[PDB]
Amino acid sequence: NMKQFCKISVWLQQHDPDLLEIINNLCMLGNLSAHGVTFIYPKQAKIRDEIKKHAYSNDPSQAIKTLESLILPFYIPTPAEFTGEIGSYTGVKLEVEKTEANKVILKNGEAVLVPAADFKPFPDRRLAVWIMESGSMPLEGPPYKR
Amino acid sequence: PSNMKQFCKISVWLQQHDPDLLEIINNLCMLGNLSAHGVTFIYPKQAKIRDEIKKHAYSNDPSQAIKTLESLILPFYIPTPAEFTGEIGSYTGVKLEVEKTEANKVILKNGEAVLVPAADFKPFPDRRLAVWIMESGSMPLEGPPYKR
Amino acid sequence: NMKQFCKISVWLQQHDPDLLEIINNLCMLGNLSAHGVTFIYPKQAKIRDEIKKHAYSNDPSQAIKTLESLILPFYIPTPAEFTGEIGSYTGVKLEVEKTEANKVILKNGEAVLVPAADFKPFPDRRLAVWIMESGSMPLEGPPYKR
Protein backbone atom coordinates (compact mmCIF):
# COMPACT_ATOMS: atom_id res chain seq x y z
CA ASN A 1 0.00 0.00 0.00
CA MET A 2 1.60 3.22 -1.25
CA LYS A 3 1.32 6.65 0.36
CA GLN A 4 2.81 8.63 -2.53
CA PHE A 5 1.61 8.06 -6.10
CA CYS A 6 3.37 8.48 -9.44
CA LYS A 7 0.16 7.56 -11.30
CA ILE A 8 -3.52 7.69 -10.36
CA SER A 9 -3.98 4.00 -11.22
CA VAL A 10 -1.92 3.07 -8.14
CA TRP A 11 -4.33 5.05 -5.95
CA LEU A 12 -7.43 3.56 -7.60
CA GLN A 13 -5.97 0.06 -7.24
CA GLN A 14 -5.88 0.52 -3.45
CA HIS A 15 -9.43 1.95 -3.26
CA ASP A 16 -11.44 0.28 -6.06
CA PRO A 17 -9.64 -2.39 -8.12
CA ASP A 18 -12.90 -3.20 -9.92
CA LEU A 19 -13.28 0.34 -11.25
CA LEU A 20 -9.66 0.35 -12.44
CA GLU A 21 -10.30 -2.98 -14.19
CA ILE A 22 -13.23 -1.39 -16.03
CA ILE A 23 -11.10 1.60 -17.06
CA ASN A 24 -8.54 -0.81 -18.53
CA ASN A 25 -11.15 -3.03 -20.20
CA LEU A 26 -12.65 0.11 -21.79
CA CYS A 27 -9.24 1.17 -23.19
CA MET A 28 -9.39 4.34 -21.07
CA LEU A 29 -6.24 3.99 -18.94
CA GLY A 30 -4.55 6.51 -21.22
CA ASN A 31 -7.09 9.13 -20.15
CA LEU A 32 -5.88 8.58 -16.56
CA SER A 33 -2.20 9.09 -17.48
CA ALA A 34 -0.47 12.47 -17.55
CA HIS A 35 -1.39 18.50 -19.52
CA GLY A 36 -2.49 17.30 -16.05
CA VAL A 37 -4.96 14.65 -14.93
CA THR A 38 -7.61 15.03 -12.22
CA PHE A 39 -9.72 11.98 -11.35
CA ILE A 40 -13.12 12.25 -9.65
CA TYR A 41 -13.74 9.17 -7.51
CA PRO A 42 -17.48 8.62 -6.86
CA LYS A 43 -17.62 7.65 -3.19
CA GLN A 44 -21.23 6.43 -3.27
CA ALA A 45 -21.33 2.75 -4.21
CA LYS A 46 -24.62 3.18 -6.08
CA ILE A 47 -22.86 5.31 -8.70
CA ARG A 48 -19.95 2.89 -9.11
CA ASP A 49 -22.16 -0.21 -9.43
CA GLU A 50 -24.25 1.61 -12.03
CA ILE A 51 -20.94 2.06 -13.88
CA LYS A 52 -20.15 -1.64 -13.45
CA LYS A 53 -23.69 -2.57 -14.53
CA HIS A 54 -23.41 -0.61 -17.78
CA ALA A 55 -19.79 -1.61 -18.42
CA TYR A 56 -20.65 -5.32 -18.28
CA SER A 57 -23.83 -4.86 -20.34
CA ASN A 58 -24.15 -5.52 -24.06
CA ASP A 59 -23.56 -1.77 -24.61
CA PRO A 60 -21.10 0.01 -22.29
CA SER A 61 -21.81 3.40 -23.88
CA GLN A 62 -23.14 4.95 -20.66
CA ALA A 63 -20.27 3.58 -18.56
CA ILE A 64 -17.82 5.14 -21.02
CA LYS A 65 -19.34 8.63 -20.97
CA THR A 66 -19.73 8.49 -17.18
CA LEU A 67 -16.07 7.55 -16.73
CA GLU A 68 -15.21 10.28 -19.24
CA SER A 69 -17.18 12.69 -17.04
CA LEU A 70 -15.02 11.67 -14.05
CA ILE A 71 -11.61 12.23 -15.69
CA LEU A 72 -10.36 15.77 -16.29
CA PRO A 73 -7.31 16.41 -18.53
CA PHE A 74 -6.28 19.22 -16.17
CA TYR A 75 -4.21 19.51 -12.99
CA ILE A 76 -6.66 20.86 -10.39
CA PRO A 77 -5.15 20.30 -6.91
CA THR A 78 -7.05 22.96 -4.93
CA PRO A 79 -10.45 24.68 -5.22
CA ALA A 80 -8.57 27.72 -6.57
CA GLU A 81 -7.87 25.93 -9.87
CA PHE A 82 -11.55 24.94 -10.32
CA THR A 83 -11.89 27.93 -12.63
CA GLY A 84 -11.88 28.91 -16.28
CA GLU A 85 -12.25 26.70 -19.34
CA ILE A 86 -11.88 23.32 -17.64
CA GLY A 87 -13.83 20.11 -17.92
CA SER A 88 -13.80 16.36 -18.39
CA TYR A 89 -13.13 14.17 -21.43
CA THR A 90 -16.77 14.68 -22.42
CA GLY A 91 -15.83 18.29 -23.20
CA VAL A 92 -18.48 19.82 -20.94
CA LYS A 93 -17.28 22.95 -19.15
CA LEU A 94 -17.45 22.74 -15.35
CA GLU A 95 -19.17 25.61 -13.53
CA VAL A 96 -18.52 26.15 -9.82
CA GLU A 97 -21.60 26.76 -7.68
CA LYS A 98 -19.82 27.17 -4.33
CA THR A 99 -16.14 27.26 -3.37
CA GLU A 100 -14.48 26.57 -0.02
CA ALA A 101 -11.00 26.11 1.41
CA ASN A 102 -11.19 22.33 0.94
CA LYS A 103 -14.50 21.75 -0.87
CA VAL A 104 -16.09 22.54 -4.24
CA ILE A 105 -19.72 22.21 -5.35
CA LEU A 106 -20.34 22.20 -9.11
CA LYS A 107 -23.44 23.06 -11.09
CA ASN A 108 -25.17 20.70 -13.55
CA GLY A 109 -25.41 17.76 -11.17
CA GLU A 110 -24.65 19.29 -7.76
CA ALA A 111 -21.46 17.28 -7.27
CA VAL A 112 -19.71 17.97 -3.96
CA LEU A 113 -15.97 17.44 -4.42
CA VAL A 114 -13.40 17.17 -1.62
CA PRO A 115 -9.70 16.50 -2.31
CA ALA A 116 -8.59 12.98 -1.45
CA ALA A 117 -6.86 13.19 1.92
CA ASP A 118 -4.70 10.13 1.21
CA PHE A 119 -3.79 10.95 -2.41
CA LYS A 120 -0.50 12.75 -2.70
CA PRO A 121 1.45 12.87 -5.98
CA PHE A 122 5.17 12.60 -6.69
CA PRO A 123 7.27 15.79 -7.00
CA ASP A 124 6.34 17.88 -10.07
CA ARG A 125 3.84 15.21 -11.18
CA ARG A 126 0.59 17.01 -11.96
CA LEU A 127 -1.92 14.49 -10.63
CA ALA A 128 -4.94 15.13 -8.41
CA VAL A 129 -7.79 13.00 -7.07
CA TRP A 130 -11.08 14.36 -5.71
CA ILE A 131 -13.80 12.47 -3.85
CA MET A 132 -17.37 13.02 -5.08
CA GLU A 133 -19.31 12.75 -1.82
CA SER A 134 -22.69 13.47 -3.45
CA GLY A 135 -24.32 14.44 -6.72
CA SER A 136 -23.11 13.62 -10.21
CA MET A 137 -20.59 15.11 -12.61
CA PRO A 138 -22.04 16.94 -15.64
CA LEU A 139 -22.71 14.84 -18.74
CA GLU A 140 -24.12 17.41 -21.18
CA GLY A 141 -23.64 21.17 -21.33
CA PRO A 142 -21.67 24.03 -22.86
CA PRO A 143 -18.17 23.00 -23.94
CA TYR A 144 -14.95 24.42 -22.58
CA LYS A 145 -12.49 25.85 -25.10
CA ARG A 146 -9.69 23.30 -24.98
CA PRO B 1 -14.24 -9.80 -12.40
CA SER B 2 -14.05 -8.72 -16.05
CA ASN B 3 -17.12 -9.84 -18.03
CA MET B 4 -17.12 -7.41 -20.96
CA LYS B 5 -19.67 -8.01 -23.72
CA GLN B 6 -18.08 -5.51 -26.13
CA PHE B 7 -14.33 -5.38 -26.66
CA CYS B 8 -12.06 -2.40 -27.32
CA LYS B 9 -9.06 -4.71 -27.80
CA ILE B 10 -8.61 -8.43 -28.43
CA SER B 11 -6.63 -8.88 -25.19
CA VAL B 12 -9.81 -8.23 -23.19
CA TRP B 13 -11.55 -11.10 -24.99
CA LEU B 14 -8.53 -13.37 -24.47
CA GLN B 15 -8.25 -12.44 -20.79
CA GLN B 16 -11.78 -13.73 -20.15
CA HIS B 17 -11.54 -16.86 -22.33
CA ASP B 18 -7.88 -17.95 -22.08
CA PRO B 19 -5.83 -15.90 -19.59
CA ASP B 20 -2.86 -18.28 -19.74
CA LEU B 21 -2.59 -17.83 -23.51
CA LEU B 22 -2.66 -14.05 -23.09
CA GLU B 23 0.11 -14.33 -20.50
CA ILE B 24 2.13 -16.33 -23.05
CA ILE B 25 1.60 -13.59 -25.65
CA ASN B 26 2.70 -10.93 -23.15
CA ASN B 27 5.67 -13.00 -21.96
CA LEU B 28 6.79 -13.30 -25.60
CA CYS B 29 6.47 -9.53 -26.21
CA MET B 30 3.77 -10.08 -28.84
CA LEU B 31 0.97 -7.98 -27.33
CA GLY B 32 1.74 -5.31 -29.94
CA ASN B 33 0.85 -7.71 -32.75
CA LEU B 34 -2.62 -8.01 -31.18
CA SER B 35 -3.23 -4.23 -31.19
CA ALA B 36 -4.35 -1.90 -33.96
CA HIS B 37 -4.63 -1.92 -40.56
CA GLY B 38 -6.96 -3.95 -38.37
CA VAL B 39 -6.22 -7.18 -36.53
CA THR B 40 -7.74 -10.66 -36.82
CA PHE B 41 -6.94 -13.27 -34.15
CA ILE B 42 -7.29 -17.03 -34.64
CA TYR B 43 -7.96 -18.79 -31.33
CA PRO B 44 -6.74 -22.43 -31.24
CA LYS B 45 -9.51 -24.63 -29.86
CA GLN B 46 -7.82 -28.04 -30.03
CA ALA B 47 -5.59 -29.19 -27.19
CA LYS B 48 -2.58 -30.35 -29.22
CA ILE B 49 -2.20 -26.95 -30.89
CA ARG B 50 -2.57 -25.04 -27.62
CA ASP B 51 -0.42 -27.45 -25.59
CA GLU B 52 2.48 -27.21 -28.04
CA ILE B 53 2.31 -23.40 -27.78
CA LYS B 54 2.60 -23.67 -24.00
CA LYS B 55 5.38 -26.27 -24.14
CA HIS B 56 7.43 -24.43 -26.77
CA ALA B 57 7.00 -21.12 -24.93
CA TYR B 58 8.28 -22.50 -21.60
CA SER B 59 11.17 -24.38 -23.24
CA ASN B 60 14.79 -23.35 -23.82
CA ASP B 61 13.85 -22.09 -27.31
CA PRO B 62 10.48 -20.28 -27.53
CA SER B 63 10.92 -19.46 -31.23
CA GLN B 64 8.53 -22.21 -32.36
CA ALA B 65 5.85 -20.79 -30.07
CA ILE B 66 6.57 -17.33 -31.49
CA LYS B 67 6.17 -18.56 -35.07
CA THR B 68 2.94 -20.41 -34.23
CA LEU B 69 1.47 -17.32 -32.55
CA GLU B 70 2.52 -15.27 -35.58
CA SER B 71 0.46 -17.66 -37.72
CA LEU B 72 -2.62 -16.96 -35.55
CA ILE B 73 -2.49 -13.14 -35.82
CA LEU B 74 -3.37 -11.43 -39.10
CA PRO B 75 -2.63 -7.68 -39.52
CA PHE B 76 -5.92 -7.40 -41.43
CA TYR B 77 -9.57 -6.83 -40.51
CA ILE B 78 -11.35 -10.00 -41.66
CA PRO B 79 -14.82 -10.18 -40.04
CA THR B 80 -16.67 -12.48 -42.46
CA PRO B 81 -15.84 -15.27 -44.94
CA ALA B 82 -16.12 -12.68 -47.72
CA GLU B 83 -12.98 -10.87 -46.52
CA PHE B 84 -10.85 -14.04 -46.77
CA THR B 85 -9.55 -13.04 -50.19
CA GLY B 86 -6.74 -11.11 -51.82
CA GLU B 87 -3.23 -10.45 -50.53
CA ILE B 88 -3.81 -11.26 -46.86
CA GLY B 89 -1.90 -13.35 -44.36
CA SER B 90 -0.52 -13.70 -40.86
CA TYR B 91 2.66 -12.28 -39.32
CA THR B 92 4.49 -15.21 -40.91
CA GLY B 93 3.79 -13.41 -44.20
CA VAL B 94 2.29 -16.49 -45.88
CA LYS B 95 -0.66 -15.74 -48.15
CA LEU B 96 -3.86 -17.50 -47.10
CA GLU B 97 -5.50 -19.68 -49.76
CA VAL B 98 -9.17 -20.52 -49.23
CA GLU B 99 -10.17 -24.12 -49.90
CA LYS B 100 -13.93 -23.77 -49.39
CA THR B 101 -16.13 -20.85 -48.29
CA GLU B 102 -19.42 -20.92 -46.39
CA ALA B 103 -21.75 -18.33 -44.89
CA ASN B 104 -20.11 -18.72 -41.46
CA LYS B 105 -17.12 -21.00 -42.08
CA VAL B 106 -13.83 -20.88 -43.99
CA ILE B 107 -11.44 -23.77 -44.69
CA LEU B 108 -7.89 -22.79 -45.65
CA LYS B 109 -5.28 -24.71 -47.61
CA ASN B 110 -1.78 -25.37 -46.25
CA GLY B 111 -2.98 -26.78 -42.95
CA GLU B 112 -6.72 -27.43 -43.36
CA ALA B 113 -7.59 -24.63 -40.94
CA VAL B 114 -11.35 -24.70 -40.26
CA LEU B 115 -12.25 -21.20 -39.06
CA VAL B 116 -15.54 -20.14 -37.45
CA PRO B 117 -16.18 -16.53 -36.34
CA ALA B 118 -16.31 -16.16 -32.56
CA ALA B 119 -19.92 -15.14 -31.95
CA ASP B 120 -19.21 -13.78 -28.46
CA PHE B 121 -16.50 -11.40 -29.73
CA LYS B 122 -18.30 -8.13 -30.51
CA PRO B 123 -15.85 -5.25 -31.07
CA PHE B 124 -16.60 -1.61 -30.47
CA PRO B 125 -18.24 -0.08 -33.58
CA ASP B 126 -15.09 1.98 -34.31
CA ARG B 127 -12.60 -0.91 -33.92
CA ARG B 128 -11.45 -3.02 -36.88
CA LEU B 129 -11.04 -6.20 -34.85
CA ALA B 130 -12.13 -9.77 -35.49
CA VAL B 131 -11.71 -13.12 -33.72
CA TRP B 132 -12.16 -16.53 -35.35
CA ILE B 133 -12.11 -19.99 -33.76
CA MET B 134 -9.88 -22.61 -35.39
CA GLU B 135 -11.83 -25.81 -34.76
CA SER B 136 -9.36 -28.10 -36.55
CA GLY B 137 -6.22 -28.00 -38.66
CA SER B 138 -3.36 -25.52 -38.48
CA MET B 139 -2.79 -22.03 -39.81
CA PRO B 140 -0.25 -21.69 -42.64
CA LEU B 141 3.34 -21.47 -41.38
CA GLU B 142 5.48 -21.66 -44.53
CA GLY B 143 4.37 -20.85 -48.06
CA PRO B 144 4.24 -18.20 -50.78
CA PRO B 145 4.15 -14.71 -49.27
CA TYR B 146 1.38 -12.21 -49.86
CA LYS B 147 2.21 -8.99 -51.67
CA ARG B 148 2.86 -6.17 -49.20
CA ASN C 1 8.81 -21.03 -16.13
CA MET C 2 10.25 -19.10 -19.04
CA LYS C 3 13.77 -20.10 -20.08
CA GLN C 4 14.37 -17.32 -22.62
CA PHE C 5 13.19 -13.76 -22.02
CA CYS C 6 12.12 -10.88 -24.25
CA LYS C 7 12.09 -8.43 -21.31
CA ILE C 8 13.60 -8.39 -17.83
CA SER C 9 10.16 -7.96 -16.24
CA VAL C 10 9.17 -11.52 -17.18
CA TRP C 11 12.22 -12.84 -15.32
CA LEU C 12 11.44 -10.68 -12.28
CA GLN C 13 7.81 -11.85 -12.40
CA GLN C 14 9.05 -15.40 -11.74
CA HIS C 15 11.76 -14.67 -9.16
CA ASP C 16 10.37 -11.67 -7.24
CA PRO C 17 6.84 -10.50 -8.06
CA ASP C 18 6.95 -8.24 -4.99
CA LEU C 19 9.99 -6.38 -6.33
CA LEU C 20 8.33 -6.05 -9.75
CA GLU C 21 5.21 -4.62 -8.11
CA ILE C 22 7.42 -2.08 -6.32
CA ILE C 23 9.06 -1.10 -9.61
CA ASN C 24 5.63 -0.65 -11.21
CA ASN C 25 4.29 1.23 -8.17
CA LEU C 26 7.26 3.60 -8.54
CA CYS C 27 6.66 4.03 -12.30
CA MET C 28 10.11 2.58 -13.05
CA LEU C 29 9.08 -0.30 -15.33
CA GLY C 30 10.21 1.70 -18.36
CA ASN C 31 13.73 1.90 -16.93
CA LEU C 32 14.06 -1.87 -17.40
CA SER C 33 13.08 -1.85 -21.10
CA ALA C 34 15.59 -1.27 -23.89
CA HIS C 35 20.45 1.05 -25.96
CA GLY C 36 20.67 -2.05 -23.77
CA VAL C 37 19.56 -2.64 -20.19
CA THR C 38 21.31 -4.51 -17.37
CA PHE C 39 19.42 -5.31 -14.16
CA ILE C 40 21.17 -6.17 -10.88
CA TYR C 41 19.01 -8.36 -8.64
CA PRO C 42 19.99 -8.06 -4.95
CA LYS C 43 20.09 -11.61 -3.62
CA GLN C 44 20.27 -10.69 0.07
CA ALA C 45 16.83 -10.34 1.64
CA LYS C 46 17.38 -7.29 3.85
CA ILE C 47 18.46 -5.14 0.90
CA ARG C 48 15.10 -6.04 -0.65
CA ASP C 49 13.57 -5.66 2.82
CA GLU C 50 14.78 -2.05 2.99
CA ILE C 51 13.65 -1.33 -0.58
CA LYS C 52 10.11 -2.36 0.35
CA LYS C 53 10.22 -0.37 3.60
CA HIS C 54 11.36 2.87 1.96
CA ALA C 55 8.98 2.24 -0.96
CA TYR C 56 5.73 2.13 1.04
CA SER C 57 6.93 4.88 3.41
CA ASN C 58 5.95 8.56 3.42
CA ASP C 59 8.88 9.31 1.08
CA PRO C 60 10.05 6.63 -1.39
CA SER C 61 13.09 8.70 -2.42
CA GLN C 62 15.58 6.10 -1.18
CA ALA C 63 13.76 3.12 -2.70
CA ILE C 64 13.74 5.05 -5.98
CA LYS C 65 17.45 5.89 -5.82
CA THR C 66 18.30 2.34 -4.74
CA LEU C 67 16.46 0.82 -7.71
CA GLU C 68 18.09 3.38 -10.02
CA SER C 69 21.49 2.07 -8.90
CA LEU C 70 20.38 -1.48 -9.77
CA ILE C 71 19.38 -0.71 -13.39
CA LEU C 72 22.09 0.06 -15.94
CA PRO C 73 21.27 1.65 -19.34
CA PHE C 74 23.90 -0.59 -20.95
CA TYR C 75 24.09 -4.13 -22.35
CA ILE C 76 26.65 -6.01 -20.23
CA PRO C 77 26.31 -9.78 -20.80
CA THR C 78 29.79 -10.87 -19.68
CA PRO C 79 32.55 -9.57 -17.36
CA ALA C 80 34.38 -8.35 -20.48
CA GLU C 81 31.80 -5.58 -21.01
CA PHE C 82 32.21 -4.25 -17.44
CA THR C 83 34.57 -1.52 -18.62
CA GLY C 84 34.54 2.03 -19.92
CA GLU C 85 32.11 4.84 -19.16
CA ILE C 86 29.30 2.75 -17.67
CA GLY C 87 26.99 3.30 -14.73
CA SER C 88 23.47 3.08 -13.40
CA TYR C 89 20.51 5.44 -13.77
CA THR C 90 21.98 7.41 -10.86
CA GLY C 91 24.81 8.41 -13.22
CA VAL C 92 27.66 7.30 -10.94
CA LYS C 93 30.50 5.67 -12.86
CA LEU C 94 31.22 2.03 -12.03
CA GLU C 95 34.84 1.04 -11.39
CA VAL C 96 35.81 -2.63 -11.53
CA GLU C 97 38.07 -3.92 -8.76
CA LYS C 98 38.22 -7.59 -9.80
CA THR C 99 37.17 -9.38 -12.98
CA GLU C 100 36.80 -13.13 -13.52
CA ALA C 101 35.34 -15.48 -16.13
CA ASN C 102 31.90 -15.53 -14.48
CA LYS C 103 32.20 -12.94 -11.70
CA VAL C 104 32.86 -9.21 -11.33
CA ILE C 105 33.57 -7.26 -8.13
CA LEU C 106 32.94 -3.50 -8.08
CA LYS C 107 34.41 -0.67 -6.05
CA ASN C 108 32.38 1.77 -3.92
CA GLY C 109 30.52 -0.98 -2.07
CA GLU C 110 32.24 -4.25 -3.07
CA ALA C 111 29.33 -5.56 -5.15
CA VAL C 112 29.99 -9.15 -6.25
CA LEU C 113 28.06 -9.68 -9.50
CA VAL C 114 27.46 -13.07 -11.12
CA PRO C 115 25.27 -13.37 -14.24
CA ALA C 116 21.92 -14.99 -13.52
CA ALA C 117 22.14 -18.69 -14.35
CA ASP C 118 18.54 -18.82 -15.65
CA PHE C 119 18.34 -15.53 -17.59
CA LYS C 120 19.04 -15.98 -21.31
CA PRO C 121 17.87 -13.12 -23.56
CA PHE C 122 16.20 -13.41 -26.93
CA PRO C 123 18.84 -13.44 -29.72
CA ASP C 124 18.27 -9.86 -30.98
CA ARG C 125 17.50 -8.39 -27.53
CA ARG C 126 20.23 -6.59 -25.56
CA LEU C 127 19.21 -7.56 -22.03
CA ALA C 128 21.29 -8.97 -19.18
CA VAL C 129 20.61 -9.81 -15.53
CA TRP C 130 23.26 -10.13 -12.82
CA ILE C 131 22.84 -11.45 -9.27
CA MET C 132 24.41 -9.30 -6.55
CA GLU C 133 25.62 -12.02 -4.19
CA SER C 134 27.23 -9.57 -1.74
CA GLY C 135 27.84 -5.87 -1.29
CA SER C 136 26.10 -2.73 -2.47
CA MET C 137 25.77 -0.83 -5.71
CA PRO C 138 27.27 2.69 -5.68
CA LEU C 139 24.94 5.52 -4.67
CA GLU C 140 27.19 8.58 -5.05
CA GLY C 141 30.45 9.27 -6.85
CA PRO C 142 32.07 10.62 -10.01
CA PRO C 143 29.69 10.32 -12.96
CA TYR C 144 30.31 8.71 -16.29
CA LYS C 145 29.19 11.08 -19.04
CA ARG C 146 26.64 9.50 -21.41
TrEMBL record, chain B:
This is CP530R. It comes from African swine fever virus. The gene is CP530R. The chain holds residues 2 to 153 of 530 of the full protein.
